[PDB]
Amino acid sequence: RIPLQIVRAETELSAEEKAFLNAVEKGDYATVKQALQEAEIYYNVNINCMDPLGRSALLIAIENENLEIMELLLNHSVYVGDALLYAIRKEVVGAVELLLSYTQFSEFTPDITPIMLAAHTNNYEIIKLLVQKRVTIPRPHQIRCNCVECVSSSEVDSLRHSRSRLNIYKALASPSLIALSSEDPILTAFRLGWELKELSKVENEFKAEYEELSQQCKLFAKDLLDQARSSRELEIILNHRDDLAKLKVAIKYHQKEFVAQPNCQQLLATLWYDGFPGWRRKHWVVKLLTCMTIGFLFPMLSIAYLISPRSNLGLFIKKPFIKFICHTASYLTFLFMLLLASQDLHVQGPPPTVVEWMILPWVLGFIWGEIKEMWDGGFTEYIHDWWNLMDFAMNSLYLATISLKIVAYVKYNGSRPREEWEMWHPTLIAEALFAISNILSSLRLISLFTANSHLGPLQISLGRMLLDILKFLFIYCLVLLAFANGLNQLYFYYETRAIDEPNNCKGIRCEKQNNAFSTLFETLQSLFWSVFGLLNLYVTNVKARHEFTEFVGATMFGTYNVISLVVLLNMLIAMMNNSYQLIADHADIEWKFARTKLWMSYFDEGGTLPPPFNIISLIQNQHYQEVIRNLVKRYVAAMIRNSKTTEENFKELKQDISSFRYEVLDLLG
Amino acid sequence: SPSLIALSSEDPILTAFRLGWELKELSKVENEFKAEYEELSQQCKLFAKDL
Amino acid sequence: RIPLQIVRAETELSAEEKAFLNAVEKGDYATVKQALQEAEIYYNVNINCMDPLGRSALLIAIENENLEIMELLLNHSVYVGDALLYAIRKEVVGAVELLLSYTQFSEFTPDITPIMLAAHTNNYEIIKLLVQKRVTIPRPHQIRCNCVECVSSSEVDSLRHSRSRLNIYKALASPSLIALSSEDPILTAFRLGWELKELSKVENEFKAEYEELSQQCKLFAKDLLDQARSSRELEIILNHRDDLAKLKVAIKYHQKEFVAQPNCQQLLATLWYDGFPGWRRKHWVVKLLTCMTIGFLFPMLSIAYLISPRSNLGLFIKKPFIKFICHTASYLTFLFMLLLASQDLHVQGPPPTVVEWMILPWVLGFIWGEIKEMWDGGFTEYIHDWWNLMDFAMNSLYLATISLKIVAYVKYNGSRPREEWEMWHPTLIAEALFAISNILSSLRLISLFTANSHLGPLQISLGRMLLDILKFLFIYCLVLLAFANGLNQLYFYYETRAIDEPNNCKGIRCEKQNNAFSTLFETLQSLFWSVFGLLNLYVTNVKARHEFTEFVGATMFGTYNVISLVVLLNMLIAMMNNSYQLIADHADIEWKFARTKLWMSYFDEGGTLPPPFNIISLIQNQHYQEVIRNLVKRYVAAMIRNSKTTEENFKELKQDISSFRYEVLDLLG
Ligand SMILES: CC(C)CCC[C@@H](C)[C@H]1CC[C@H]2[C@@H]3CC=C4C[C@@H](OC(=O)CCC(=O)O)CC[C@]4(C)[C@H]3CC[C@]12C
Ligand SMILES: CC(C)CCC[C@@H](C)[C@H]1CC[C@H]2[C@@H]3CC=C4C[C@@H](OC(=O)CCC(=O)O)CC[C@]4(C)[C@H]3CC[C@]12C
Ligand SMILES: Clc1ccc(Cn2c(CN3CCCC3)nc3ccccc32)cc1
Ligand SMILES: Clc1ccc(Cn2c(CN3CCCC3)nc3ccccc32)cc1
Ligand SMILES: [Ca+2]
């Protein structure tokens, strides 16, 4: 048998104390009043005694929402320590008002204060009541602060310091506490969410709590925007300066839900189709014909803007959608010329052809536009855009091409057949670089999928899955390098000269593959091409009769095949499935944020002409404050309605019924 | 029972650890009633974590 | 503007009728009583008037659970038609008892009767109250009944007939109505669930409702079994005759949940490990060593059973687990001999070797065991097992092999080299058939995965996904046949003789593939092998300079590749994913049912010896009734507890409070 006793004993209550606590629980006002009056005289009952659950009489009265018994206990001067915190957590306005007018165990940490707890409960009534007085919340220090106080607190007690910081940020990120006590609730929500996201990044632990607090701030900003009821209010909000300034700030803080607001998107769409008033209601054929017409007329629009910007055609290109169409048409003509550029080849360093002469101004315009964007935007913004990396690569390659061409033009005059050219001849390197540049230039069209409704979210999904692909590539490369090292170690003894080969061809790119694993570089290439099955099996064979060596090499090759294809590739498929399912929910918001950024990029005056043509306050504050006041009122009302539309409710109902029953029985009897 | 471990136990954490281990072993041994022993062991682990 | 009026007008109530209905809704007994007494004298208020929702005063009283006002209305002789149905649906015992003691719109169809509705509500109290009287439910006819009444009702009104049949089966399948008014609740649940499943199969519409009713009956049987509290009760239940007879009946009706009951599984496990009392608590190495020892000693156990069944070794094989081990060991030795059978080949029809002479008794034993199982079990049971099909194939092939060998032995005596043998020589056909038989014999080991905990549910999952594979194979074959027809139509003009080929080899199985699409059979084979990439591209090339024909053939081949691989194969993967996710939940129950069938197959006396050694009542009814009574009581109590542990509840609370308030105000004032 297992004897069961009380290992951690406490102080039991007497019979009279238990009876008094039972009377308090049942809500019998008369018996509780008699017990208090008798305790004043006989001192037989301790009014501050706890229960087996640790609650005192005052805590029992608070938990039952019994205001009469609460006031009766308060009038008899019972212990009140931390009772206000319990009243606030219970979210009972009457208890809070009663207690405001006036080391034991506690359910609240020592750093919790009444205003902080009210903010944690996000109860607008109690938060407003506490802010009516002079209450303050301590300022959290910098995320990476290194002052003496922060390091001293962290070293003395890391748990307490982290808990206090989390409690402070829970208090500040309260939507009700931001609705009050905040000059600009929208900007406060933006920056508070950004700081919470940064804290989530920095704090490896407590990451989920900071992430959810940041998400809560983002949702509060979105709902405040949702409360707008007219286009005038929306324009006032988005144009406020601390045009579309606040929208730009929201984009800066990655407020995807705020930007993808349907009314914000509608306003941005009206700005986007400046020229066409009825683009929303048109047939597919009409839109396609209009887009084709504007694309084919892009040089005329660019020339008209160059000559006279103030005309029906001069300023027609400054419209965002028209500007986007013209830039896309210019890039498409550039790609068409790139395709045509491959339609005498023995000249060493030939002069550029007509197609190359037409291509050159586009390349110069691309370089000039890149450096102009670099100057106008800045450094950090330029480097934050990943597409710019590709642009840089393209430009560099093109520049290299030009350089090499010039070199080949000045260093060579004779016409020698390409068969006997040097391997590192300038023309061959220039042509290879130009081909790579063509590949990258055509691949640059992916970024335009954002402008499309059907292609945008798909591109978002693929870009997000590229992260899982990158994660898997590391372990794949580790396995590939391991097996390459092993196969090269095994096979490098049987390396044969190219002369001994049947066609004087050495390597795996010959008709009969040979020396697949002779060198580490060739072993890497062989193991790569085996993924796609282009490496034949007889490459694991050697001229000598070393059948054990051939079998071991074949076994290494087979194990590599099994791992890379059966195991790693299926695991990659499973990871992609999971990630795509995870990101399918938020694809629309991500796409709309990306498309909003694309649209905003075409609102600026700079960069109007596509290549190659580019180389040739108090009242506003008062209006914003009035609109913000209206939005805050509407948001508070809506959230109260949503909250209004548990076991403690049934406990309160029972308490009310019992109190009424005792009152009636006392009045009658 | 988490409440019965909170009382009547010198070391609730060690008791929870060893009780969860024994429940997992019983789940392995008992082909039937496997789910109930698994959930009891998980409950003991959660009690230790909450403590 | 859209004018809004009442298109379907009704008869509005007067002011006094509306006031009376409001008084009834509020529960004011005094005003309702006064209104009734005044209506008796002045005839100014219609006591049977409806409301805008169609409810009368009696229906309002029933819906509020106001028994006092209900009785007051009944004492004044108000219209009571279909009020009992509303009382039953509300599941109020007091209303039902009041109404039992005593063409307008109705919420219940005309075929609904009080007992049927009570069964639909599955309320044990009301069902028992109605069964206390003499109530009956009409018998549904046969599922495929063809009597005059059924066809007449179906032709006159199919909707009404189907609705009435569904209502009757909803009534009968009520767990409370089966707990009462049923001699054998378990057998009734089994057969009722089976019949509901058959109706679901037959009725293309209403399939989901019959499926859920059948599932409900299965769950009721499982819960009744769950209520057993001792092994004596469980043995009494499972051994009842209308051993393990009721368990066999449950297996017959595909009661997977009933069979996979943990207590049923525990009893079956104790029966399964008859010899070993402590097999449950043993190490993996001990179990593996014991299994290996018993497997290696299987011939000794078989011989001991043959000589003297009554000994420590004679009856040691009759134990189910030992019998399974011996049969598995015998089959494994047979497969080992099959492997050894491939370790002079110019003899036409050679005499059988030592390995073949050892194989022959195993084949004879397999055939004898198959026919013995066919005789002992029956025809329908034998043909219902799909594995038997494979067995049949194996046996047939083996028989064919023997026949051909005999033919080749008697028809040929000379030793001619195999190079110049006929294509259809008996020896070649016999060897091909024997190889196919070996493949099938080794593949027969899949059925033993059921005996394993880790391999059982996996086999269940793969077998269930084979259905999706079969479904996809139809459309794949349609596409394959279409493209084969097209490619053959295009290419059959350029068919070349085998002599013209470089190595006198024609077809795709040559070193240089040729005539890939010349004939329909060869086109089918080429398109099949292209799925795995073994068909080279140059097969779409012809000797003539018909570049358009070659391009069109290559385009057909490429379209076939795109469809079969990119489209069809990925769709097959998606289907397999969905089906595997769907069937992962019930894998354990399916596996335990299959393993129970496997274990039961080894409980019988017949078939004890594996090949080749196989060729050398009132008191029981009273006990079952007592156990069933105990189980029914426990089940009723448990289900009532589970149900006890809506807006109408709050409406009833408000009604009670208002009635109390009116009573107090009348008593005081
Ligand atoms: C598929 C093969 C033939 C490559 C074709 C290359 C280009 C001809 C395609 C690739 C991506 C296409 C672009 C994808 C995105 C759009 C957005 C599209 O706009 C919309 O879909 C909605 C209306 C709007 O832009 O406001 C305008 C056409 C455009 C630039 C497309 C123009 C044609 C592009 C450049
Ligand atoms: C993987 C390659 C080498 C093929 C091996 C063929 C056989 C040697 C394997 C295949 C399936 C195996 C069987 C799969 C299922 C079982 C159930 C297993 O029993 C259990 O797993 C639980 C204990 C119990 O049976 O009650 C006994 C061994 C046995 C017959 C296995 C014996 C060994 C088998 C016949
Ligand atoms: Cl070699 C290259 C270099 C840079 C770039 C980047 N870049 C683009 C590309 N856009 C045009 C349609 C899809 C994205 N337009 C530009 C206009 C001005 C400056 C840079 C520009 C593309 C290609
Ligand atoms: Cl050529 C063949 C023909 C039939 C069969 C079917 N069969 C089996 C197969 N069992 C043994 C282990 C896995 C399933 N044992 C038997 C014992 C008696 C009769 C038939 C029997 C297998 C192979
Ligand atoms: Ca750029």
Ligand SMILES: [Ca+2]
């Ligand atoms: Ca069989």
Ligand SMILES: [Zn+2]
């Ligand atoms: Zn600091």
Ligand SMILES: [Zn+2]
């Ligand atoms: Zn009938």
